[PDB]
DNA sequence: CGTACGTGCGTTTAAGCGGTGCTAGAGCTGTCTACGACCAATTGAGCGGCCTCGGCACCGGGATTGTGAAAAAAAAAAGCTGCA
């Protein structure tokens, strides 16, 4: 039990991060409880969004 | 000034009622654990600060585009007949 480093958003294969969002989802009073994936598909979106605008 | 709509007739339709019978599926229970909160400790991603240098704002000057008048051509249109 050493064994550290990698984020969620190189997981997920995306540039947003996923970690921040779900902070951001945490601390904004959106529901008592958050999934590991909400995050992830989230910003996920948000990447696709801001791509297709790009 | 033309005919699209409102009125009002007689005829036609199926909405609404009041009821009966069948059951999908809403919603409730109790059980049990995978998952998410929280935690502390650990660490590298993203912040401010800084420096650079190439994109773009600004320039002048000439090329090209777009409007309007004026003169002119084409145009419908306007006072005058004849002939019936
Ligand atoms: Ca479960
Ligand atoms: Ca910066
Ligand atoms: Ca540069
Ligand atoms: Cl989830």
Redesign the pocket.
């Known amino acids: 039990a050493?064994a550290?480093?990698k984020?969620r958003?190189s997981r997920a294969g995306l540039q947003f991060?996923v970690g921040?969002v779900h902070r951001l989802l945490?601390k904004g009073n959106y529901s008592?409880?958050?999934?590991?994936?909400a995050p992830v598909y989230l910003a996920a979106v948000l990447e696709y969004l801001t791509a297709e605008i790009l």
């Open positions: 050493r550290k480093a984020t958003s991060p921040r945490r008592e409880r958050v999934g590991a994936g």
